[PDB]
Structures are given as C-alpha cells and as structure tokens.
Design an enzyme around this catalytic site. Structure first.
Site, PDB file in Angstrom:
ATOM      1  N   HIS A   1       0.799  -1.220   0.000  1.00 41.83           N
ATOM      2  CA  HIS A   1       0.000   0.000   0.000  1.00 41.83           C
ATOM      3  C   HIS A   1       0.837   1.278   0.000  1.00 41.83           C
ATOM      4  O   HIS A   1       0.265   2.369   0.066  1.00 41.83           O
ATOM      5  CB  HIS A   1      -0.942  -0.014   1.218  1.00 41.83           C
ATOM      6  CG  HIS A   1      -2.154   0.867   1.089  1.00 41.83           C
ATOM      7  ND1 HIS A   1      -2.898   1.260   2.181  1.00 41.83           N
ATOM      8  CD2 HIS A   1      -2.750   1.435   0.011  1.00 41.83           C
ATOM      9  CE1 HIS A   1      -3.897   2.027   1.783  1.00 41.83           C
ATOM     10  NE2 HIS A   1      -3.830   2.148   0.470  1.00 41.83           N
TER      11      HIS A   1
ATOM     12  N   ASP B   1      -2.418   1.503  -4.728  1.00 41.08           N
ATOM     13  CA  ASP B   1      -3.666   1.808  -4.041  1.00 41.08           C
ATOM     14  C   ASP B   1      -4.731   0.796  -4.445  1.00 41.08           C
ATOM     15  O   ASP B   1      -4.520  -0.051  -5.317  1.00 41.08           O
ATOM     16  CB  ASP B   1      -4.138   3.232  -4.361  1.00 41.08           C
ATOM     17  CG  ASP B   1      -3.046   4.266  -4.175  1.00 41.08           C
ATOM     18  OD1 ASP B   1      -2.116   4.017  -3.382  1.00 41.08           O
ATOM     19  OD2 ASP B   1      -3.118   5.332  -4.822  1.00 41.08           O
TER      20      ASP B   1
END
Lengths: 233, 120, 233, 233, 233, 233, 120, 120, 233
Positions: free
Chosen positions: F206, F210
C-alpha cells in the site's frame, strides 16, 4: 391599333441566308420509322454501371450511327462548289442549340474515330459556351451534315428543316410514340405487342444526291439503330 | 422504412374431414402443419413482381442482345404465414404488400377447394 | 553422337536484341483472370447478323479494350529514351505473327478511333503479307504496347514474354478453361455454375511504371472486358 | 505527334538501383495458395470486442506470421555482403507505401516480440508521415524482408516484385477470390463448399537461399496462416 | 546485434555460375495444368502386381513423357555454343538432389530407349551415392534438359527455376491439389466432379526456342500425361 | 519425551527475510474468480496440431496475461528504494519451484515480447536445473512480480502468499472447481449450466499501489483471461 | 478391435394389416422391405454420441471464438439392420454399441405404434 | 439419316378405376398425365444398348486396367411418348429403334398390371 | 502322263540350308495358350486417340514382349560357334515376309530400347522393300530370335517351324479362337464366360537351352502378354 419594332441587325443576316438557300438548293424529303426499345435498354445498362463519370443520351447514339452511315455511303458527305464537286473523308456534324438570342450551330469533329463519352462532353461544353455567349467564330463555320432534335416536346410528331448553304443534307428527329405490332406467340397464334417508335425525316439536295442514294442512307441508319451492338464495328 | 400488413379469414373444416377419413380407412394420422407447409409450397410458384422492380446487368445485356426478347412477369418467393383462424396475417413492406396478397388468396383457394391435393 | 548447324545471320540480330532487353529493363509481372462468357455471346450475336462482310475474333476485342485502358491510364503509353521520358497521345499496338523464318510483329495504327471491322481487316492483310514475305520495313518499326496470344493451343494456361527494347509493357494471353463459381439461385440458396475464364499476364518495366499503375491498368482492362457493352463507351 | 517530359532526379536514383538489382541477384519465384476464412472470422471476432482502441487488418497477421516463419527458418533472414554472409537474429520487415512522389518503404522493428496493436499503430503512424513528406532518412534504410500488398484492387490475382539490393527475399500478396473445395458431409457423401483464397508469391535470391529452403519457408507461413491460433505460439 | 559467417568456397563457384546464367540467357516461362488421376490409377495397378522387385513414382513417368515430347519436338533438345547451334539425337535428363552440402544434379542416360524400372533404379542408386558423397565428376557434367520436383511439400503450388549454363530449358513440378470440373452425367445433366491436378512450369531461353515451339512442347507433354497408355507408343 | 534438531544455516537466511518483509511492507489483498473453459478449449486445440515439438499449460497463459496487464497498468511494475521510486519498462516474472531442499525462485525475462513455446521451454529448463542443484546466483536475484500456483492439489481452494522484499506485488492461483450459472435458453426461460472456475488472489503493498490500481489490474487480467484470443494483441 | 452385438425382438402384424387393407381399398400392394427402409430413414436422425468422442480443429476453433457456444449432443448415422423376427440384430464395436441401441429401440417403437407413418 | 417408328396399343380402363375409387374414399383427384409421366420414369431405368455402340477412352482404360472387368449391358435414357389410345407411338433412328421398343413394352406391362404402383 | 520343270537355282540354296539345320540342331518344342482380350482393348484404345500418324497390330506387341522376356532370361539370346558360346546384350528379331518369289527375312534392331510406332514403321518399310525386290544383303543376315505369324488364315490353329542355322530359337503364332472359362459370379455360383485365346509354339535347340530355361521363357512371355501394362517397365 398595333405596334411596330425595328428589325434587328442580326435578323437580316439569317433572313438573307434562308432566302438564298431555298432559291439555290432544290429540296426533296424522305421519312422513316425507327424502333428504339433496344437502344433504351442499352442506355439504361450503360448509365448504371458508372459512378458519376458520364451520362449518355439518344442524340450521341444517333450522331455515331450517322457517322457510320455516312462512311458506308460517302456521296452524301460532299459539297457543291463553283464548278467542281468536293468529296471529304472525315465526318463533322453540326448540332443545333436554341437560346433566347437566337439559334447557334456548335460543331463536333472526328466523330468516326470517337466514343460516346467524348461526344457527350464536347456537345455539353459547347452548349454551355453557346448559352454563355463566348463562342469563337471558327467553332461554328462548316460541317458536312446537320442534325436537329425536338424530343423534349411530346406534341411534335414530325417536322421539316431547311438545309444550310454549303451542305447537302439535314436530319430532323421527332418525339417518341407507341404503336401496336404483331407478335407470333409460341402457342401458334398472333398477339398484340406495344413497341415505341420515333419518326425521322431527312431533307436532301437533288444536285449532289439522288433518290436511291438517300434511300440507301436511310437503310444503313435504320440497320445501325435497330441493332445497336453494330455500333461497335 | 414504412411497413404494412395484409389479412384474410380461413375455414379448416375440409382438412379436418380429410384427416379423420384417412385415419379410418388406412391408419395414417398426420397434423394440420404439413397441410399448411405443403399449401405454402404450391403457392410460392407464380406470384407477380413489384411495379418498381429494377433489373440487373445480365438481364439487360441478354435483352440488348436477343436471347430472351420475351421478358418475365413472374418470380418465386419464400413466405411464411402467421397462425390463426376464426385470421391468416402477414407483415411486409409497402412495395411487395400487393405480391404478398396474391399468396394469401392462392392459399385461401387451394385449402378450401383443393385440400385433397395436399395428400401424397 | 550429335549434329551441328551454323547459327543464322538473323538469329544473332534477335539474340543480341533479347540479350540487351533483359540487362536494360528490369521486369515485374502482374496476373489476372477474366471471364469471357458475355464476350463470346456478343461475338456470336454479331457474327450471325452479317452476310459475309466480316468475321470477328477475341483478339480484336482485347486490342480495343487495351486501347481504352491505355487512354484512361496514359503512364503506360510511354517510353524511356536516353535522358528524357516520351509520352504519346496515340495508341499503336504490336501484334506477333509466327512464321518458319521466325516471328514477326505487324503494327496497327489509330486503334482508339477505330472499329472492330477495320482492326480485323488490317490484322489479316498484314498477317497474309507477313506470311508471304513482302513486308516493308517501316510497317514493323515501333509501337507503344505489344500483345501475344496462344489460345490456338489448349495446353497453355498462362505464360510470360520479354519486353521489346523501346517499349515499356507487353501483354500475354493464354487459352480458355472452365472453373466453378457461386450463383445465388432465385430459390434463396447458393449453387455451382461453370464459368469460362482466361488468365492474362502483363510484364512491365519498373523505371517508367510502378506497381499501383500496373494494378490500375489491369483493373481498367478487366472492367472493360467483363462488361463488353462498355467497349462502345 | 507526341510529347516529352524531362526525367526526374529521383527517377534515375531508383532506375540505377533497379537496374543494379537484376544484374546482381539471380531470381527464382515460388507460389502458394492460402485459405483465409478462419483468419477473417478471427479478425471479425477481435474487431467487435473493442470500444474504439484499435482496428486490425490482414497485413498485420501476415507480418507476424512472416516473423514466426523467419524465426523457424533463419537462412532467409540473411544478407550477402562483399565477401561474407550476414545472419541476423532480429526480424525487421519493410512495408511499401505508394505516394504520387513515388513509392516509399516504412520499416517496423521488433516484430517477433510484439503484438498486433503495436504493429498496426506503427504501420499507420509511418504511413501518415510518409504521405505528409516528413520522413527521416534512418527510418527507411535497411531491413531483412520486404512485403507488398495489392488487395485494394480486386483485379490483381497474383504478381511479381523485384528484390531490394541488400536483402535476399520479397513477398507479394494478391487479392482474395472464391474457389470450390470438397467437404465430407456428415451424411456420408462429398459436397461442394465455397472457400475464399489468396495467392501469395515469394521471390528469392539463389546465392543465399535454395529451393528446398524457400519451400520450407512457404510451408511454415502456410501452416501459421491456415491455423490462426498458432500465431500465439 | 547480428552475426557473420565466412562465405564458403563452393558457394561462389555456384554464385558466379548463377550470376552468369541470368546475364547470358534471356528467360521466358510457360505454365500448364495436368490431370494425373489416370496416372495414379495406373501406378497403383502396376505397384500391386509386383512381388518386391520394384516400386515406381510420378517422376519416372514425367521423365519418360519428357523424353517422348523431346523426340517429337527436337528444337528444345539443343544447345547454344560460341558460334554454332548444337542439336542432339539422344535425350539425357538432369535430376536435382538436395543435400545439406547443397543441391546436386545426378544424370540419367538413354531415357528414350528405356523402361520405368531401369530409370527408377538409376535415379535411386545415384541419389544414394549423391547423399553419401562419393560421386564421380563425369556423372554430373552435361545434359539436354533439367527437371525439378517439390511435390514432397504440399505448400508449393507452382514455382520457377533458373536454367543451367549450357542447356536451353528447365522444368519445374509442383504439388498436387484438387479442383472442380464439369461431368456430363448419364441422366442428361451437368454435375461437379473433383479432379486432382498439378501445375507445371517450364522456363525456356529465347535465342534457341520461340513461343510457338514451347507451346507445342507443352502440348505434347500434356497429351502424353493425360492419356498414360500412350507412354508405350 | 521429545526430540530436538539444530536449526539449519539456510533456515535463518529465509526466516530473517520473511520477518523483515512483514514489518517493512503493509499488505492488502484482492480476490477474483475466473472462468477458464475457453482457455482449456484453446489449449486442447493447440496441443493436438503439434507433432511433439512442445506441450503447453495454464501457467504460461497466466504469465503472458500478467505481462499484458502489467503493460496496461505500469504502476504495479515498480519498486520502493531508499528515497526514490523505481519504474521499469520490461516485465520479468518470478516463478516458484518447490524441492525437498527448499523453495527456489527461477526467473523469466522478456515476457512481453515472447511466445508461449519459449516461456514453457525456459520454465522447464530452469525447473530441471533447480531440481538438480546447479543454479547460478544471477539467475534468481530480482524481478517485478511473483507468481505461485497450487493447482496440482484439488484440496486448495484459495490461499495467501507473502511479498518478496524488493517487489510490490504477488499472485496466488488456486485449483479449479465447478459452479452453476444461469443460461437464457432460446425457448425463453432460464436454465442451469455448469462452468469451471478458478479463484485468484493478489497481495499488494500500500506504499506503491492503491486499491483502485489493484482493482483495475485485476480487471485487465480477467478481461484477458476470459477472452483468450486477446492474448494476440 | 473387440466387437459386440445387440438384439431386440419384433412383431410385424400391424404392417401386414396396413398392407392388406391398402390392397383392398385402392389396389396398391407393396413389400415389407420399403417399410423397413423407411423406418430406418426416420430412425437415423437423432442418436446420441459416444462418450469417448474427440472433436476436430474447426469445432474447437468455433468454440474458442463464440459462434457455437452451445455444443451438440446429436449426430446422424448410416445403419443397416439384419433380417429376422420371432430377431433384429446388429454387430458394432464397443464404443458405439450404446448408440446402435438407441437405433434399435427407436425403430422398435415406430414400427409397432407408427406403422401408418411409413405410407406416402 | 434414315428414321423409323414403333407403335403399340393401350387400354386405360384400370387407371380410370383407380382414379374414381381414390376420389370416393379420400377426396384426391388427379389427372391421367401424372400416371403417364410416373410410368415413363420407372420405365427408363433398365434398357439394353445398341449393338453398334462404341465405347469412350475412360471405359477402355478402366477395362485395360482391371477395375470394371465386368462390363455393362444397360443404360438409362430420356424418352417422351406420343398421345393416343384405341396408339402409343415413337419416332427414332434405326440404330436405337430396338431399344425404344423395350420402353414401349415395359410401360405397356406396368400400366396394365401395375397401375396401383403409380400412386404415392 | 506327267510334266517336269527344272529345279531353280534359288531352290537348292534353301534346300541345302534346311537339310543342314535338321542334322545340326536337335529340336524340342513347347506350347502355351495366351489370353489377348486386354491387349485388343488396349490396341483399340490407342488406335482411336490418333489422327492418322500410325496404326498398330498384335505382332508389334509380341515383338516387344519377346524382347523383354529375352532380357529377363538371356540364355536364349545366344549362339553356338565352332568351339565357343556367344552371348549377346542387344535383341535383334527376324520377321518373315512371304512373296511369290519366296520367303525373305527382314530384321529389326534395337527393340529393347524402342517403342511400338518405330517398330511398326520399320516392319512396314522393310516389308514394302522386300515386296519390291530392292533389299540390300546386310539387311537380312543375322539375328538372335525369329518369329512367324499366320493369324490371317482362321484355319491354322497351331503349327511348327524350323530354326535358322546360326540361331537357337524360333516362335510360331497361330490364329485366335474362342473358349469357355469359369467365372465366380457375385451371387455365389459359377458361370460360363467366353474368352478369346491364341496358341503359341516355341522351338528350341537342346545344345544351348534346356527344358527349364524354355519353360521360364514361356512364363515371362505369358506374364507380359496377359498383363499388358507391364510392357512399360
């Protein structure tokens, strides 16, 4: 009560010429009937396989057939001079274009060795320039044969025309019409069919041409028209 | 593309009679459907052409020549009716609407005066 | 065991010329297939309405169609000189005649403005004089395009030919044959029909012509042949 | 009667090159027929699942299949230098673009490791720049194989092409046509089916390639084209 | 990125020869299609009545038919020397054998006065010795005609070949294929039959041979092949 | 009662690495279901037209589709360095091979510009060398994406995997299974059909990726797999 | 190549009845043979496929594409029975043995409940 | 080219009987014409060949080989009779005159002993 | 009552020779029956595809088959000299021509390597010159085998002939006849068929030939005749 308008300068130039032709050329006429169904079918066949390049008409076919008939019988492609006869070998045809200012006489050259497309393009370019009034003099001076058509008006069945001074023949074309003809039905009887015909008149001078020559000329024209494929050879 | 429909009543009593009778004398029993299709086959044989029909190159060439100087006024087709009785209906464009009618009346005549014809 | 025959004086005059053409003109060929059923029907229709005046053949039709295609695409009706390109406006076609003293090339002039009868008469008069060995030199000197036909032998489907020195194209015609084609039967299905076809090969030089120009030339020839009525146009 | 046009400066630059190729490279041709029904079905399937990103054509499929066939037989992906043979490991294909200022040869690189979308995008960008006349020289200098297509004209069944100077092979593609083939109907008989085919011609030099090598090359190309799924493999 | 391999000594011995042939012999090709169903039936009939003595192939039939056609038209069984034409009376045929060390040309003598068994035995003994690399030089020096076959690869429909230096003709054979033909069914109609055909190409020099001579040669070959019993005659 | 075995030297080298990955890369997962009936049909079609050259598997298809999806969405083909982001342009894929001595990490290069055959050959050569324990270090050092498959065991429906230290994504593939789907029968109703599906899990970091980017990545992979022809472009 | 046979009894009384009756009402008399062949024709129309059927290239290609996403489970055939009654027997390999049975029962049903069907 | 004719009487009572009877039991009514054509079709199946028949290349080649060692003595035809009764006549050249006769008697037998055969 | 005529000078030249042959060569005979239906069919097939070039007969077929049989068994193609055996490798056949002046012995050379047309042309040219009495001596001096035919007379079923002095075999052919043979009809019975046969007699010397050799010779001749296609190899 009445009105008077002075005679135009150009009206005497044609009046004198017309008055000279009648007193200089004895006239005799010949008439015939032509069937043009096959010609219409041919034209329809050849006006749909194109993309916009051209568009044909009956007058071009008649002009080409005239040229061929002139070639077969050359005595009509001649002229009467002061003390000698003139015989040509190239066919030039004079077409008549009507405008409010008067009647013109555009010319087409080299018809014998030509195709329909070029004849149509020339006749239309010249018609446009004649209508727009920028025609050179050399372009309407002399030919061998003259043609007139009045098929745009259905009320003209047959009519006559006057021969030009130096020429020895003229052709007049009428409007189409429908007539009954006999057909031998396969069952072994006779029935009615509806053919479409035109009436063609030809005026000839009797100093350069005789009756038999004109009759043969009409025969060659008819043979070429009724059978249209023969326009190739 | 405007479209239009044509309709015609029908009576199927005679076909019923022929089916029943055939069932009693031999044993053969068949449905109404084959009568319908067989009538449709004999019908699409001789139907006029639209008045706005445009020919093709081969046709004009053959005329301009002289092989088929006698022209044609008939042409086959491939129609399929719509079910119904007390009616037979068809939906077609305007140009052929008239031709589609010759079909309805032809079947309307054969099936009422010639039902026996549709047997073997 | 063998035998020897001295080389003829005329065989080197042609040997040197053929050897000069290959090393002077790069060659590229193009092939096509033409359907000639309608042309045969036309020929049969036009060879029965006569009384003995003439008799036609496929070569005349191909010559006339060649002339029309040359007119539509003029880049082929050209020639390569020392330091300038030559572009003509009249189409002269060279036909090949084979004799025991070797082949010869009679020439036909003014094909664009001509009919089938004159072309046939010229080709036959010249063929007779070529066979009888009384041909003047001027009559076989130069043209724009050359044609070769071998349809007299059914065993030749397609073949190639060498280009003449001053010319920039040559056409070779084969013998007819039969092939299957699809026909849309009126019942609403597809069926097999037996069409008759010929295979035509064209050899072009790549200094005066390009691939697209030759492809367009073949397209105009094909369009004129498959639809024969357009020969009039 | 005739006209003359001066030879262009660019026409001799190509005339000399074409004249050098024929006298420097012996030529031998090979022909084959390919069925492309499955390829058309594939193209239709892959041109409808898109939203506007791309649009394919037959030339891209032929280019990719050419690359695979070159990889399987590397002797054609070669060149003849002054005194050594050159063998490559990357396939660069030369495509021909025709313009009024003459033909041009845009080049595509890395065909072996590429997809149809990139090949189409490159061929179209280069075609646009070639038509607009802003092409850099490095972009049309050298390749390994050259391709020519004429399927835009239906009158070209098969044709030949000249090999470029440093290359040792060239491929020419014709236009599609329809032929009859035998089908084993499930009822236990033989019937007629209408297949669509193209005729492909390949020209090879005989100093770097032999007949068997060219025959194997044609076999790999045919196997890849008739079975299109193998394009992935 | 690339690789280089030195040119072989034997590759220039053939490169120079191939480069000399094109600039010394103008080429013109002729094509034909032959039906070989009856020949296959004959071969099957004659390969089952044996006990193991022999086994035949199409090439032997083509060689014998070539010999007969050469005998009927002797102008092809000739050669072009410095300043004299050479005409033979015995037919020697050159067959092509491909090996990794390049192609080779074993020679068969006395074909006119010979049978299929001897021709097959000679062609196979020479093929074995050519593959094993113990061929004497006299055995591959000169002939009158050369043949090439590629029917082992189904992807080769038709192809071209280069003529050897002292010879004046060469024949190239393709692979079989299937086509539709018309059959007159006994019921009184026309139907579709599936015939098997091969396409044969012949390349000829134009200093010793003309188009008509090659066309006649192809006709004699075709007549002998389609009717196989005439091989005895 | 128990036993103790000293920890291996190689077991800490992987323990430390695994312990570093979890504390250095936050993880988030995404799951999807893929239908693979068409892919199986394609594979069967392409594994029967061969003679023994190759043999394919699902993993190669998934690898190629991965490469394409990586190309469309390049944000996943990246890496996180000390103080700068690294973005690549070539796709290298890491495949996992299990052996009794441990787990290896062979690598495949140039997947974007490659075919199925080369990928299979590389994966099998490397698997053999990994099993035989003669693997060079450079050959298992770095990639962009890693894949794991466990379809050999039917008892594994779905599972998770840990991301490698320098990489930013990993894919895990499960075993096939069968599920019911609705089909709109032509009669105008809804029926039951039996489709075969696999469940694919993807683990992402992350810091470089995304949620939306991963969702788009999964969408491209799915689109490429369900429609297999799109593997060409 | 192992081979196996399948058999089924038959009763031909109804065909006899139809033949006799037809002979008395019209005059037509025909042999049992045409009944046998006509039954064989209507039978070889809808027969299942062997479970070990392997497809061809065109079939797989069309599926991989999406034109014939619905597959087939029927295929015609060309069988010829063997004479006999009180039985009809056929000899075929093991793979198709099952398919050959669907044929025997289909004819066994039509000829006993639909003899009339085999008339014109 | 000399030509000759062959003739044979005929009786059409049985066909009339079959038509009438069929009309009374079902409803089907058909003309004599179809009986005439259907008899003509079944006739032109097995007719001998002229004694002066010359074979073709394919026939001789196949014999010289050994595929059709048994030759043929029959060949189909396409005849059309001429109307009439109390007679059927045909006009043909001398060579086939004999073959044309086998046709007349074959139809003369079928139409008098097998009229029912020409029904469905 | 009787008459006496002096013996001719030429009658003793043959009387002495005949008297020397019997006392110098022991004789033994062998007989066989040949079916010639297929040969007649072949001859009819090959005598109708011609335009007038040639016309064949049974004797040519028998001559060629003799040559082949001689080649397979060479012990009969020999001669007995003073103290040594002579074995040849070329087959020369002696044909007998009857004229009122006596019996001649024309010769044909190179039969093994020859076709039917040349054999017929030679046999007919020589027969004409023999009838016209302008035959050179070298042309009837020596051969290896001699043949006699009497099929023009139906009343000669079988007959014998005397061997020439230097030769070791002679063949005599009779007239055809018809016999019944059994045929296995497809219905599963036996029927009667009518075959046409000839009876061939061969006379051999027992110093150069043995019984088994003659029997094998007859077998090869029979095999070649009954199966006529085998005349090719």
């Amino acid at each position: 009560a009445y009105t008077d308008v002075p005679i135009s300068g150009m009206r005497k130039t044609i009046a004198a010429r017309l008055k000279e032709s009648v007193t200089e050329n004895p006239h005799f006429f010949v008439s015939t009937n032509l069937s043009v169904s096959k010609l219409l079918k041919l034209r329809q066949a050849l006006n749909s396989s194109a993309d916009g390049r051209y568009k044909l008409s009956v007058n071009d076919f008649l002009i080409k057939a005239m040229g061929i008939a002139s070639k077969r019988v050359p005595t009509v492609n001649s002229s009467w001079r002061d003390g000698v006869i003139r015989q040509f070998e190239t066919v030039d045809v004079s077409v008549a274009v009507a405008t409010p200012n008067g009647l013109i006489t555009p010319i087409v050259k080299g018809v014998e060795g030509k195709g329909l497309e070029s004849i149509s393009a020339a006749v239309k370019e010249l018609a446009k320039k004649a209508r727009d009034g920028k025609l050179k003099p050399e372009e309407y001076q002399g030919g061998s044969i003259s043609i007139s058509n009045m098929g745009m008006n259905p009320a003209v069945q047959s009519f006559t025309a006057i021969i030009n001074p130096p020429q020895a023949a003229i052709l007049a074309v009428g409007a189409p019409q429908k007539v009954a003809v006999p057909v031998e039905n396969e069952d072994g009887t006779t029935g009615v069919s509806w053919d479409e015909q035109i009436i063609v008149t030809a005026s000839f001078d009797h100093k350069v041409v005789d009756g038999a020559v004109g009759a043969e000329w009409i025969r060659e024209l008819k043979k070429v028209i009724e059978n249209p494929l023969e326009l190739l050879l | 593309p405007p479209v239009a429909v044509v309709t015609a009543p029908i009576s199927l009593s005679a076909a019923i009679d022929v089916q029943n009778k055939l069932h009693k004398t031999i044993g053969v029993f068949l449905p109404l459907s084959t009568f319908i299709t067989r009538a449709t086959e004999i019908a699409n044989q001789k139907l006029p052409l639209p008045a706005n029909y445009q020919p093709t190159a081969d046709e004009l060439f053959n005329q301009v020549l002289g092989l088929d100087k006698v022209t044609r006024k008939e042409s086959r087709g491939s129609y399929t009716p719509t079910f119904g009785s007390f009616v037979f209906s068809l939906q077609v464009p305007k140009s052929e609407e008239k031709r589609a009618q010759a079909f309805l009346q032809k079947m309307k005549l054969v099936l009422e005066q010639e039902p026996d014809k549709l047997v073997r």
